[PDB]
Amino acid sequence: GSMSYDYSSLLGKITEKCGTQYNFAIAMGLSERTVSLKLNDKVTWKDDEILKAVHVLELNPQDIPKYFFNAKVH
Template identity: 35%
Template sequence: MTFDYSKLRGRIREVYGKYENLIPKISMSEATLSRKLNGKSYFDNQEILELSNALDIPSEERNLYFFKVEVREGEQKV
């Protein structure tokens, strides 16, 4: 399963301008953040909470940022 992090990417740009400005506020490297945003690994619960706090994402909106399933061309949403 692949997640669509486009809304999360937009929020990072909106709040911090660029990813490099977010890194000092969280406990992961730029390379790790990049890997996760590119679907090479998943965010764990602690990382989701930390990013949500750094980006002022309300708990009721986390699903929109972290759990939107990417639908590929030719696939159907379930």
């Protein structure tokens, strides 16, 4: 979130693969409405949700703490 990862490194990959959060949604199979909740700060990803992003974005499960570790801390 604004505290603990503004997802800047992630967003780069998002742009690199999809373009934008909008397109992220599209590729992931989510709606922008939902993405902008989850990929923002309210609805922090579950492990399978992380995994699905990894599948789209082509990330690695070990490279995860760099993108999504806490990304929320309260």
